[PDB]
Write an enzyme that holds these catalytic residues in place. Structure first.
Site, PDB file in Angstrom:
ATOM      1  N   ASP A 193      44.045  26.104  34.897  1.00 58.36           N
ATOM      2  CA  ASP A 193      43.146  27.061  35.558  1.00 58.36           C
ATOM      3  C   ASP A 193      41.683  26.598  35.721  1.00 58.36           C
ATOM      4  OD1 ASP A 193      42.118  29.614  36.462  1.00 58.36           O
ATOM      5  OD2 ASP A 193      42.158  30.480  34.443  1.00 58.36           O
ATOM      6  N   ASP A 197      39.998  28.352  42.660  1.00 60.61           N
ATOM      7  CA  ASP A 197      40.729  28.764  41.455  1.00 60.61           C
ATOM      8  C   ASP A 197      42.230  28.445  41.444  1.00 60.61           C
ATOM      9  OD1 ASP A 197      41.345  30.043  39.010  1.00 60.61           O
ATOM     10  OD2 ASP A 197      40.908  32.079  39.708  1.00 60.61           O
TER      11      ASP A 197
HETATM   12  C1  LIG Z   1      38.267  41.317  35.075  1.00 57.77           C
HETATM   13  C2  LIG Z   1      38.190  39.876  35.603  1.00 57.77           C
HETATM   14  C3  LIG Z   1      38.405  39.604  36.969  1.00 57.77           C
HETATM   15  C4  LIG Z   1      38.346  38.286  37.451  1.00 57.77           C
HETATM   16  C5  LIG Z   1      38.058  37.220  36.570  1.00 57.77           C
HETATM   17  S1  LIG Z   1      37.946  35.554  37.188  1.00 57.77           S
HETATM   18  O1  LIG Z   1      36.655  34.955  36.847  1.00 57.77           O
HETATM   19  O2  LIG Z   1      38.333  35.534  38.591  1.00 57.77           O
HETATM   20  N1  LIG Z   1      39.106  34.844  36.272  1.00 57.77           N
HETATM   21  C6  LIG Z   1      40.315  34.242  36.812  1.00 57.77           C
HETATM   22  C7  LIG Z   1      40.447  32.754  36.384  1.00 57.77           C
HETATM   23  N2  LIG Z   1      41.666  32.190  37.009  1.00 57.77           N
HETATM   24  C8  LIG Z   1      42.934  32.915  36.704  1.00 57.77           C
HETATM   25  C9  LIG Z   1      42.845  34.440  37.067  1.00 57.77           C
HETATM   26  C10 LIG Z   1      44.131  35.206  36.772  1.00 57.77           C
HETATM   27  O3  LIG Z   1      44.069  36.196  36.047  1.00 57.77           O
HETATM   28  N3  LIG Z   1      45.301  34.752  37.326  1.00 57.77           N
HETATM   29  C11 LIG Z   1      46.649  35.329  37.105  1.00 57.77           C
HETATM   30  C12 LIG Z   1      47.566  34.454  36.185  1.00 57.77           C
HETATM   31  C13 LIG Z   1      46.770  34.080  34.919  1.00 57.77           C
HETATM   32  C14 LIG Z   1      46.005  32.894  34.886  1.00 57.77           C
HETATM   33  C15 LIG Z   1      45.247  32.598  33.752  1.00 57.77           C
HETATM   34  C16 LIG Z   1      45.314  33.470  32.636  1.00 57.77           C
HETATM   35  C17 LIG Z   1      46.085  34.645  32.644  1.00 57.77           C
HETATM   36  C18 LIG Z   1      46.804  34.953  33.803  1.00 57.77           C
HETATM   37  O4  LIG Z   1      47.603  36.103  33.814  1.00 57.77           O
HETATM   38  C19 LIG Z   1      48.768  36.073  34.607  1.00 57.77           C
HETATM   39  C20 LIG Z   1      49.907  36.821  34.204  1.00 57.77           C
HETATM   40  C21 LIG Z   1      51.093  36.810  34.957  1.00 57.77           C
HETATM   41  C22 LIG Z   1      51.136  36.010  36.118  1.00 57.77           C
HETATM   42  C23 LIG Z   1      50.007  35.247  36.532  1.00 57.77           C
HETATM   43  C24 LIG Z   1      48.813  35.268  35.778  1.00 57.77           C
HETATM   44  C25 LIG Z   1      41.570  35.069  36.417  1.00 57.77           C
HETATM   45  C26 LIG Z   1      37.828  37.491  35.204  1.00 57.77           C
HETATM   46  C27 LIG Z   1      37.895  38.815  34.720  1.00 57.77           C
END
Ligand SMILES: Cc1ccc(S(=O)(=O)N[C@H]2CNC[C@@H](C(=O)NCC3c4ccccc4Oc4ccccc43)C2)cc1
Ligand SMILES: *[C@@H]1O[C@H](CO)[C@@H](O)[C@H](O)[C@H]1NC(C)=O
Length: 337
Positions: free
Chosen positions: A38, A223
């Site tokens: 990520d 991302d």
């Molecule tokens: C509230 C909040 C909104 C956005 C962000 S951010 O800065 O855009 N963070 C992003 C960073 N890249 C992965 C993003 C994401 O969740 N993707 C979704 C993907 C994932 C990737 C990393 C960790 C946990 C995670 O959870 C699941 C669960 C099931 C299936 C796919 C995923 C969040 C942070 C916090």
């Protein structure tokens, strides 16, 4: 900073065009985990053997057991990691991590609280943050900074290849370079707005020929951990109105028969238009007038300091092979093969 000659690669598995994960080994002897790499985060985490079995996600995933590792070094510092779909919490530990045949001593989180929503939907066990130390929770040194410190890599870059779902290659990460077998033409670079985040300036979003959105400029987070292309709730509402799509709880849909007729979506980055046709953003499950087809574009309100921002996830990377350049603080795009 020291440079070597080594390029290392990690083979990824493509799960439903939404999850791209590879393997890492943690400890002595290694305990293997399926991880998402990520660019939008900077912490390494895996589920812990100390995770209470009342967290059903912990029953369904591989758990790190420190008591089985001879190279483990205790830390115990508590940490919370917040993602777009959900949150994980645990404590910090140190051990040897192997990724693409590169062995590195790494500080990582052992997750003891893993909610069933969304973690039961996760094919992967944990996450490997490919972002900068500025985004790292607890100011933990990220794995790529630790790999650079070793002075083995040919260059301070890493590259992403995400394939279209199929028994072929799901995707590939190259540490210390790029793979010319997976792109064609030449890379076009866009400099980072600032060090600390894989975020670039976006000069406009077009639906067909007309630049409907981001006319006065906006932000684009590149991302690898995001499955889709995302914009703010407001941008996505305008974009979807223009496409003729209906809002559901978690996504947007079109009638399946209208999927191939949808206009092209263009993203103005650097001195180039990055175009996606409907085939690149519609989950074309059928051509039926009696069925609904999901789009690979979602609303996502990313909080400040990083947001409000667009996120160019797997939908975008599938079309455009991506090189993340740490040496020059830039992102290169080339057409994926
Ligand atoms: C509230 C909040 C909104 C956005 C962000 S951010 O800065 O855009 N963070 C992003 C960073 N890249 C992965 C993003 C994401 O969740 N993707 C979704 C993907 C994932 C990737 C990393 C960790 C946990 C995670 O959870 C699941 C669960 C099931 C299936 C796919 C995923 C969040 C942070 C916090
Ligand atoms: C945990 O690791 C940090 C470095 O990331 C270190 O400064 C701290 O002292 C460690 N804590 C313990 C209890 O070992």
């Amino acid at each position: 900073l020291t440079l070597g000659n080594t390029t290392s690669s990690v083979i990824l598995t493509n799960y439903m065009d939404t999850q791209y994960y590879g393997e890492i080994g943690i400890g002595t002897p290694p305990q293997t985990f399926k991880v998402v790499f990520d660019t939008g985060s900077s912490n390494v985490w895996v589920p812990s053997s100390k995770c209470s079995r009342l967290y059903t996600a912990c029953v369904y995933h591989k758990l790190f057991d420190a008591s089985d590792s001879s190279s483990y070094k205790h830390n115990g510092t508590e940490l919370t990691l917040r993602y777009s779909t959900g949150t994980v919490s645990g404590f910090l530990s140190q051990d040897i991590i192997t990724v693409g045949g590169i062995t590195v001593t790494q500080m990582f989180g052992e997750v003891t609280e893993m909610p069933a929503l969304p973690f039961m939907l996760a094919e992967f066990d944990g996450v490997v943050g490919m972002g900068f130390i500025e985004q790292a929770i607890g100011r933990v040194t990220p794995i790529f900074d630790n790999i650079i410190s070793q002075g083995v890599l040919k260059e301070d870059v890493f590259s992403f290849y995400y394939n279209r779902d199929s028994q072929s290659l799901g995707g590939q990460i190259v540490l210390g370079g790029s793979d010319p077998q997976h792109y064609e033409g030449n890379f076009h670079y866009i400099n980072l707005i600032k060090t600390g985040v894989w975020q670039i300036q976006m000069k406009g979003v077009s639906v067909g020929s007309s630049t409907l959105l981001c006319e006065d400029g906006c932000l684009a987070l590149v991302d690898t951990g995001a499955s889709y292309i995302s914009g703010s709730t407001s941008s996505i509402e305008k974009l979807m109105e223009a496409l003729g799509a209906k809002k559901r709880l978690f996504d947007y849909v079109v009638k399946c028969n209208e999927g191939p007729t949808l206009p092209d979506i263009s993203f103005h980055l650097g001195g180039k238009e990055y175009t996606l046709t409907s085939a690149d953003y519609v989950f074309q499950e059928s051509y039926s007038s009696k069925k609904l087809c999901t789009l690979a574009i979602h609303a996502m309100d990313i909080p400040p300091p990083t947001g409000p921002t667009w996120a160019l996830g797997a939908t975008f990377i599938r079309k455009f092979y991506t090189e993340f350049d740490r040496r020059n603080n830039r992102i290169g795009f080339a057409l994926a093969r």
